[PDB]
Amino acid sequence: KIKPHGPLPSQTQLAYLGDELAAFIHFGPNTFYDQEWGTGQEDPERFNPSQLDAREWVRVLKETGFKKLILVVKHHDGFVLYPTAHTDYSVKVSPWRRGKGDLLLEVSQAATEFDMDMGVYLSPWDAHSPLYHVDREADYNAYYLAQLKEILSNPNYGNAGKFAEVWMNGARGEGAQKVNYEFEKWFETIRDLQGDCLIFSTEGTSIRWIGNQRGYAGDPLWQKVNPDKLGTEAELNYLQHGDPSGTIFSIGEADVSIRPGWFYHEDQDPKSLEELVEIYFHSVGRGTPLLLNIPPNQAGLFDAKDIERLYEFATYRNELYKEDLALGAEVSGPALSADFACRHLTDGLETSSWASDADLPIQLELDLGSPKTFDVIELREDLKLGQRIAAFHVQVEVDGVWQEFGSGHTVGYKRLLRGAVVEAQKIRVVITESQALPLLTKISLYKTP
Amino acid sequence: KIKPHGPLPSQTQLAYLGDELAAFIHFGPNTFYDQEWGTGQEDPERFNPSQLDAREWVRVLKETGFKKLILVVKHHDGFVLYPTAHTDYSVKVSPWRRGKGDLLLEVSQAATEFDMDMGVYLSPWDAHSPLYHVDREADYNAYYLAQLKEILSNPNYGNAGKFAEVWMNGARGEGAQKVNYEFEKWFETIRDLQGDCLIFSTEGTSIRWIGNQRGYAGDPLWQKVNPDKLGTEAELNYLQHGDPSGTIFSIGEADVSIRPGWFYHEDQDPKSLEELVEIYFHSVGRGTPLLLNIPPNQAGLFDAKDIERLYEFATYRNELYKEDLALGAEVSGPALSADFACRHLTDGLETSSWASDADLPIQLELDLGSPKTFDVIELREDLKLGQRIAAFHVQVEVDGVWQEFGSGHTVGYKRLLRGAVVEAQKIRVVITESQALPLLTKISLYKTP
Numbered sequence: 056k057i058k059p060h061g062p063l064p065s066q067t068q069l070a071y072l073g074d075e076l077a078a079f080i081h082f083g084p085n086t087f088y089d090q091e092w093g094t095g096q097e098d099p100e101r102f103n104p105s106q107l108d109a110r111e112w113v114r115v116l117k118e119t120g121f122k123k124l125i126l127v128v129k130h131h132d133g134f135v136l137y138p139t140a141h142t143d144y145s146v147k148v149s150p151w152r153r154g155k156g157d158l159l160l161e162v163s164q165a166a167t168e169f170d171m172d173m174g175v176y177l178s179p180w181d182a183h184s185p186l187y188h189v190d191r192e193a194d195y196n197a198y199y200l201a202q203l204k205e206i207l208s209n210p211n212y213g214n215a216g217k218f219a220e221v222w223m224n225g226a227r228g229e230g231a232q233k234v235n236y237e238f239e240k241w242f243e244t245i246r247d248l249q250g251d252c253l254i255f256s257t258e259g260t261s262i263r264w265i266g267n268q269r270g271y272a273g274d275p276l277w278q279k280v281n282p283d284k285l286g287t288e289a290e291l292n293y294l295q296h297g298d299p300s301g302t303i304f305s306i307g308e309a310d311v312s313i314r315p316g317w318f319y320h321e322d323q324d325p326k327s328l329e330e331l332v333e334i335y336f337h338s339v340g341r342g343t344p345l346l347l348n349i350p351p352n353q354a355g356l357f358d359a360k361d362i363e364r365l366y367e368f369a370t371y372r373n374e375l376y377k378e379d380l381a382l383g384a385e386v387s388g389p390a391l392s393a394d395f396a397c398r399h400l401t402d403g404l405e406t407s408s409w410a411s412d413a414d415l416p417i418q419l420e421l422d423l424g425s426p427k428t429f430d431v432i433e434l435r436e437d438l439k440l441g442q443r444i445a446a447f448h449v450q451v452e453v454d455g456v457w458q459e460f461g462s463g464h465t466v467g468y469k470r471l472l473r474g475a476v477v478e479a480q481k482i483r484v485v486i487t488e489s490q491a492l493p494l495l496t497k498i499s500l501y502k503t504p
Numbered sequence: 505k506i507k508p509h510g511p512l513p514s515q516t517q518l519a520y521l522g523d524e525l526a527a528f529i530h531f532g533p534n535t536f537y538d539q540e541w542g543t544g545q546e547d548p549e550r551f552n553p554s555q556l557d558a559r560e561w562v563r564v565l566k567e568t569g570f571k572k573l574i575l576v577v578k579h580h581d582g583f584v585l586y587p588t589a590h591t592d593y594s595v596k597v598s599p600w601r602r603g604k605g606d607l608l609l610e611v612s613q614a615a616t617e618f619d620m621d622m623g624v625y626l627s628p629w630d631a632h633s634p635l636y637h638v639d640r641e642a643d644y645n646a647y648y649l650a651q652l653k654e655i656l657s658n659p660n661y662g663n664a665g666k667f668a669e670v671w672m673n674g675a676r677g678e679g680a681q682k683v684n685y686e687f688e689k690w691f692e693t694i695r696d697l698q699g700d701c702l703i704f705s706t707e708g709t710s711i712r713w714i715g716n717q718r719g720y721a722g723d724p725l726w727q728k729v730n731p732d733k734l735g736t737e738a739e740l741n742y743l744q745h746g747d748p749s750g751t752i753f754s755i756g757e758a759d760v761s762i763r764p765g766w767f768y769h770e771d772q773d774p775k776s777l778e779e780l781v782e783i784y785f786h787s788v789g790r791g792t793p794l795l796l797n798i799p800p801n802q803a804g805l806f807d808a809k810d811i812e813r814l815y816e817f818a819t820y821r822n823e824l825y826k827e828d829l830a831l832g833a834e835v836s837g838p839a840l841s842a843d844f845a846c847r848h849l850t851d852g853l854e855t856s857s858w859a860s861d862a863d864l865p866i867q868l869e870l871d872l873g874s875p876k877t878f879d880v881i882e883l884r885e886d887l888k889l890g891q892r893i894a895a896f897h898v899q900v901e902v903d904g905v906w907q908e909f910g911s912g913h914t915v916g917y918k919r920l921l922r923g924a925v926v927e928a929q930k931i932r933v934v935i936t937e938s939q940a941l942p943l944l945t946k947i948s949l950y951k952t953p
């Protein structure tokens with residue numbers, strides 16, 4: 056047996072890493088006020104998306120490869136998009152659905168139909184609530200917690216009653232009240248109702264912020280941190296790269312809007328395909344999920360251009376992965392045992408993996424059997440045994456000279472590394488630094504479309 | 505009052521950093537044999553450029569903003585491109601210029617005319633020389649040394665007899681003799697003849713390899729290293745990022761070819777303008793020089809496409825820097841003294857700088873006086889006092905919300921950081937990690953053409 060190394064991921068964490076793509080939905084009063092942050096003074100009468108079709112949101116996301124939908128149900132403005140018992144500042148007083156509307160239910164029904172996992176974003180900062188004050192913070196915490204209970208205990212919310220992620224945004228305006236949150240009590244309730252449901256927060260939960268809203272994970276990206284170096288004043292580079300000596304497994308989730316803003320603005324356009332592809336390689340291609348925000352318009356529909364762009368992005372990915380040019384390639388180099396043999400890297404069996412306790416550097420050489428043309432290499436670690444690799448490089452033989460293809464720090468769950476398009480038959484993967492004996496589950500090669 | 509921090513750059517190091525752009529020329533038997541490496545078996549009869557014109561090489565490089573030209577005078581194949589006294593394997597037995605050719609002379613004459621600084625590449629690995637053998641190590645070292653003297657002592661070579669850089673490539677083929685080099689003796693002779701002349705080597709000299717041939721400097725890029733971690737087995741990431749605790753100032757030179765290969769190949773084309781721009785931002789824009797290789801063809805001329813590409817590249821840079829949108833902006837934040845005032849960051853005077861010993865984070869806010877449109881910020885440290893900054897980020901105010909523009913690790917001699925195109929009047933530069941109290945000499949803003 057190989058012993059584990061470092062902090063190990065939970066099954067829910069591994070599941071998210073495997074899923075890769077999640078969608079965010081920011082929609083609410085801000086959409087009608089053409090703004091990014093609201094004050095809590097917005098008029099509920101303005102909230103009337105009469106053409107809203109939550110099933111279309113879910114259908115398009117499902118068809119374009121998203122595996123989770125994180126819905127904003129209360130942004131910083133404090134307007135609640137389901138009929139909570141706990142405030143009057145909700146859809147109950149809006150004309151939408153004649154006051155009888157429940158956006159969390161509408162989305163949940165569609166998600167259940169499509170087997171789309173659900174997340175829920177409930178803003179800690181609340182610019183509306185009279186309880187949002189240091190002098191009333193116990194009451195505000197009870198309000199927040201009561202809403203968690205309403206959302207997470209109702210079998211009609213979630214994907215068949217299940218939530219996969221809870222989002223606790225760390226943002227608060229200059230000159231807001233400095234309310235402190237009862238995080239542990241909140242986390243306890245989340246477990247009680249939803250088990251190992253992932254939580255995004257400023258604290259030492261299973262998901263952290265990557266430290267930017269550009270969709271950019273660092274290299275290295277260690278999916279681990281020490282919770283005592285988080286909080287609202289966590290260093291951006293600490294979030295972006297993680298901690299080589301981290302004590303908990305932590306996914307640095309890469310959130311980014313398809314538009315400049317999180318909410319829909321008529322005068323904005325979605326990112327180009329080119330732009331989304333760069334994001335993809337720097338998020339999913341660095342071993343962390345991409346959480347891409349798609350904001351419905353004032354009608355309650357995704358914008359036509361955004362929809363087109365999501366199908367274009369899905370096509371791109373489907374084409375990228377159409378053929379693994381490394382499948383069945385002969386692999387040589389050191390290997391711990393037959394059970395961890397080199398051939399496990401290209402055998403297309405996800406139940407087989409390679410490992411070596413040899414001295415570094417470790418050099419794996421692939422022979423594709425004939426010259427093939429590629430510009431992407433994919434490597435994967437076995438994170439059930441912990442993240443280990445800290446430096447590697449790749450070379451390709453060109454006219455009898457071993458030339459560089461590219462280099463990196465970490466591998467993680469999955470690392471895509473691009474290089475110049477090359478026609479080659481022999482490739483070397485060289486592991487040069489690792490915290491423990493390296494394991495890899497797969498080496499793949501692709502040509503970008 | 506301010507004490508220096510860390511290893512300080514030499515005058516020659518600072519001059520190169522200020523110059524930013526160097527050209528490389530790989531030309532020789534390999535050009536005629538359509539290969540990247542040679543064996544020393546190449547036939548000197550075949551070395552016969554129809555129309556070589558070094559003045560044209562120099563003219564174009566000068567007009568396109570290059571400040572130094574590093575010329576290969578002997579590649580791994582061992583063929584010497586000046587009439588050396590120390591081997592018969594040279595242009596003396598070539599039909600070029602009826603056996604009387606001297607490529608170093610032709611280049612130096614033109615370089616002297618155009619005041620183009622000169623570098624020389626003399627390959628340590630020599631596949632031809634009968635002295636290149638462990639049994640004949642001292643004889644090979646004496647051969648290499650004698651050639652350094654031929655090159656570096658002759659007033660007709662260099663820019664008016666001066667060389668700015670000597671290049672000692674670390675590459676050697678796997679099969680080759682394991683000759684060791686008399687580095688210290690070589691460096692002493694280089695100092696005797698050429699003073700502070702920069703040296704690129706695998707050892708602890710003034711220039712190191714960045715660790716790839718893609719034109720990519722890391723972030724961070726510490727322009728310093730510990731010589732005990734260099735040699736041929738230096739880790740690539742160590743070269744690419746430098747050493748936060750480095751003991752010598754070291755420029756990680758970013759060398760890259762305009763083509764896939766270093767030598768000219770008929771079937772290859774130059775990089776796009778877009779590709780060169782990306783390289784630029786990741787080399788010069790991360791505080792290190794770009795050394796761009798332009799290989800003459802079999803006629804001894806630069807390819808017409810390569811030339812056009814060099815002009816397009818120069819045009820781009822000229823446009824980019826045409827207007828500094830931050831000039832004269834009001835700058836607020838902590839400052840060490842009147843001598844180090846905030847206003848020095850945008851006063852246009854290269855002799856005024858800012859510093860602060862305030863507790864981190866240090867926040868500098870610029871007010872441009874009116875909304876301006878930009879997508880690049882430039883920061884510079886004062887490396888005469890040592891490299892210090894280890895983390896910073898930049899924010900811009902958009903509709904009363906402070907939004908991120910971008911973040912990084914190091915600044916160094918010069919850091920360009922691109923962000924989404926924004927129209928803003930107010931920007932914040934926030935320094936969050938620094939090895940000693942931070943200094944900056946300038947903040948500039950540009951719009952990419």
Ligand SMILES: CC(=O)N[C@@H]1[C@@H](O[C@@H]2O[C@@H](C)[C@@H](O)[C@@H](O)[C@@H]2O)[C@H](O[C@@H]2O[C@H](CO)[C@H](O)[C@H](O)[C@H]2O[C@@H]2O[C@@H](C)[C@@H](O)[C@@H](O)[C@@H]2O)[C@@H](CO)O[C@@H]1O
Pocket residue numbers: 091092223224225226227228257264267268286287288310317905906907908
């Ligand atoms: C309008 C806008 O761009 N605001 C950002 C703010 O984004 C927040 O998160 C996004 C997803 C969206 O819901 C926004 O409306 C919301 O304000 C950024 O806040 C960070 O957001 C990330 C998620 O991307 C985390 O939630 C993180 O904890 C937030 O940073 C915290 O709060 C900031 C105000 C700072 O105090 C920061 O140091 C904290 O960690 C902030 C990022 O600076 O930038 C705009 O405010």
Ligand SMILES: CC(=O)N[C@@H]1[C@@H](O[C@@H]2O[C@@H](C)[C@@H](O)[C@@H](O)[C@@H]2O)[C@H](O[C@@H]2O[C@H](CO)[C@H](O)[C@H](O)[C@H]2O[C@@H]2O[C@@H](C)[C@@H](O)[C@@H](O)[C@@H]2O)[C@@H](CO)O[C@@H]1O
Pocket residue numbers: 456457458459540541672673674675676677705706713716717735736737738759766
């Ligand atoms: C054909 C080719 O691409 N060769 C590279 C080789 O490039 C060398 O340098 C360039 C500029 C050109 O003159 C090539 O003909 C020449 O072989 C690379 O060698 C590294 O080169 C850099 C400069 O870019 C430094 O000179 C560095 O010291 C070299 O690496 C050393 O030698 C290698 C063979 C490895 O042992 C390496 O770890 C050493 O540092 C190498 C890079 O691996 O790749 C091709 O051979």
